[PDB]
Design an enzyme around this catalytic site. Sequence first.
Site, PDB file in Angstrom:
ATOM      1  N   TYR A 121       0.819  -1.208   0.000  1.00  0.00           N
ATOM      2  CA  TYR A 121       0.000   0.000   0.000  1.00  0.00           C
ATOM      3  C   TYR A 121       0.857   1.264   0.000  1.00  0.00           C
ATOM      4  O   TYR A 121       0.616   2.189  -0.773  1.00  0.00           O
ATOM      5  CB  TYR A 121      -0.937  -0.031   1.213  1.00  0.00           C
ATOM      6  CG  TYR A 121      -1.679   1.255   1.462  1.00  0.00           C
ATOM      7  CD1 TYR A 121      -2.925   1.500   0.918  1.00  0.00           C
ATOM      8  CD2 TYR A 121      -1.126   2.219   2.287  1.00  0.00           C
ATOM      9  CE1 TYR A 121      -3.588   2.690   1.177  1.00  0.00           C
ATOM     10  CE2 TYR A 121      -1.774   3.395   2.554  1.00  0.00           C
ATOM     11  CZ  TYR A 121      -2.990   3.637   1.997  1.00  0.00           C
ATOM     12  OH  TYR A 121      -3.631   4.833   2.292  1.00  0.00           O
ATOM     13  N   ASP A 139      -9.985   9.272   7.669  1.00  0.00           N
ATOM     14  CA  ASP A 139      -8.688   9.925   7.436  1.00  0.00           C
ATOM     15  C   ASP A 139      -8.916  11.421   7.245  1.00  0.00           C
ATOM     16  O   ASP A 139      -9.477  11.853   6.219  1.00  0.00           O
ATOM     17  CB  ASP A 139      -8.046   9.326   6.186  1.00  0.00           C
ATOM     18  CG  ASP A 139      -6.614   9.786   5.949  1.00  0.00           C
ATOM     19  OD1 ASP A 139      -6.226  10.861   6.435  1.00  0.00           O
ATOM     20  OD2 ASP A 139      -5.866   9.044   5.254  1.00  0.00           O
ATOM     21  N   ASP A 170       3.698  13.162   9.684  1.00  0.00           N
ATOM     22  CA  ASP A 170       3.908  11.864  10.295  1.00  0.00           C
ATOM     23  C   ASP A 170       2.561  11.239  10.614  1.00  0.00           C
ATOM     24  O   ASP A 170       1.732  11.849  11.288  1.00  0.00           O
ATOM     25  CB  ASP A 170       4.729  12.023  11.569  1.00  0.00           C
ATOM     26  CG  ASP A 170       6.136  12.460  11.279  1.00  0.00           C
ATOM     27  OD1 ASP A 170       6.787  11.807  10.483  1.00  0.00           O
ATOM     28  OD2 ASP A 170       6.566  13.460  11.872  1.00  0.00           O
ATOM     29  N   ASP A 181      -1.303   4.567  10.105  1.00  0.00           N
ATOM     30  CA  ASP A 181      -2.534   3.987   9.567  1.00  0.00           C
ATOM     31  C   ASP A 181      -2.761   2.626  10.207  1.00  0.00           C
ATOM     32  O   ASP A 181      -1.832   1.802  10.269  1.00  0.00           O
ATOM     33  CB  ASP A 181      -2.496   3.774   8.046  1.00  0.00           C
ATOM     34  CG  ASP A 181      -2.719   5.044   7.229  1.00  0.00           C
ATOM     35  OD1 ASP A 181      -2.951   6.122   7.803  1.00  0.00           O
ATOM     36  OD2 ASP A 181      -2.622   4.947   5.969  1.00  0.00           O
TER      37      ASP A 181
END
EC number: 5.3.3.1
Lengths: 128, 127
Positions: free
Chosen positions: A16, A40, A100, A103
């Site tokens: 990913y 997100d 920074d 996930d």
Amino acid sequence: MNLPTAQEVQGLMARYIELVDVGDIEAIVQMYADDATVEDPFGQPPIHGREQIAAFYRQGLGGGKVRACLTGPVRASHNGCGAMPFRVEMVWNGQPCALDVIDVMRFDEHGRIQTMQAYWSEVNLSVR
Amino acid sequence: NLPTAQEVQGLMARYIELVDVGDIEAIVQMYADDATVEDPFGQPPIHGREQIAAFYRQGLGGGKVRACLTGPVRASHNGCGAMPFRVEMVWNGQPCALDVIDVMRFDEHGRIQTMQAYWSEVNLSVR
Ligand SMILES: [Cl-]
Ligand SMILES: [Cl-]
Ligand SMILES: [Mg+2]
Ligand SMILES: [Mg+2]
């Protein structure tokens, strides 16, 4: 693939990043479940389904000039989940910016990202 | 409402600080009454303030486990954050390292409601 063991979670999550790192929007969206969600940054409502997730990554990646790289190893569970630390370098008003991020992902029983949650806010945005 | 993102970088850092020094009561004082611990992620949750002590007393009781952040805390604006760190510990009697990411939510007083710790063997090494 079925539900990714812990080694399988690790290779998938690193790929990913490799796709964000090149900006293959369509290969990214095909790593998601058809009805996935994206949060997100985590806390903002969720984005459902491949159409919307595609619109999300095009806006974010379809610019400027985004690179990304792991900044430590992916941490994978035995139930197809995992979490990874990375840093996103982009351009903002021509000023090199970095963000920074961590996930967290939950996969499905085909190796497709079912939920993603991205942790970050402005405390992690360092404009240089 | 809830700790500010910047109050999250502080609470989660302090948590690391207390692991390392090994203070169990100071760890356990950070956990809201109805908190849960999922460590590792993929188990069943631990809930009960004596059960959560007990969990920190097994891990840490030896007095020599260390730990430290390996990169910054990532804090949201809805009371939550995530952090990468590395644990020093003993396994199969040999010094080992284990890389971990914890995700934490908090409450409306700055105490922990959920802790999730992501790692598995793929994240253990032998020194
Ligand atoms: Cl790391
Ligand atoms: Cl990091
Ligand atoms: Mg690349
Ligand atoms: Mg499905």
